[PDB]
């Protein structure tokens, strides 16, 4: 989607495996602001919005 009117996918009640997204070299950047990028698998949240 466009930046003005983007897509918001609600993800919940599933296993949020972040080890693939983190390790993947296809990304130009992967940066976190409140939670270390290597602890994402251990922190269990109520909701993630993509």
């Amino acid at each position: 989607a466009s930046v003005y009117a983007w897509n918001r996918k609600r993800i919940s009640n599933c296993v949020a495996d972040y080890s693939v997204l983190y390790n993947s070299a296809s990304f130009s950047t992967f940066k976190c602001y409140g939670v270390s990028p290597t602890k994402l698998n251990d922190l269990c949240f109520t909701n993630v919005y993509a």
């Binding site: 609600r10 919940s12 009640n13 909701n47």
Partner: peptide
């Protein structure tokens, strides 16, 4: 807000519905 979704006289059907800690 659809924050959750899940999909799975001759008779008596008993049920208990309780809500604890969410």
């Amino acid at each position: 807000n659809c924050t959750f979704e899940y999909v799975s006289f001759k008779n008596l059907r008993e049920f208990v519905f309780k809500n604890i800690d969410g």
